[PDB]
């Protein structure tokens, strides 16, 4: 707040909820998140959210903001839930409440 844009804020409660207790939840204990499915994972809460609905769109704007995920890059990556869309961010945990006032667009 006094700062966290509506963007990074979502990203707060999008995370915890219920009805999202499958498509996006905190890795292990709480360092950052994953999305193990991908598909409903996008015409299902970003349009009650950010409204457009493109996929690629939301991950192509997380480069934007500084995150790396450590998956899919010139190694296997076929179906396999253990290694699901890992998102990691030193700058997105639970306490530390000033983690969110910190990440911008570049």
Known sequence: GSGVPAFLAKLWRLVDDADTNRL???????????????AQF????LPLNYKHNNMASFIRQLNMYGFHKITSIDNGG??????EI???????????????????RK
């Open 24 to 38: 996006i939840c905190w890795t292990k204990d709480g360092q950052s998140f994953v999305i193990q499915n991908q």
């Open 42 to 45: 996008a015409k299902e809460l």
């Open 78 to 83: 076929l179906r396999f839930d253990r290694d």
């Open 86 to 104: 890992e998102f990691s961010h030193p700058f997105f945990k639970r306490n530390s409440p000033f983690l969110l006032d910190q990440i911008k």
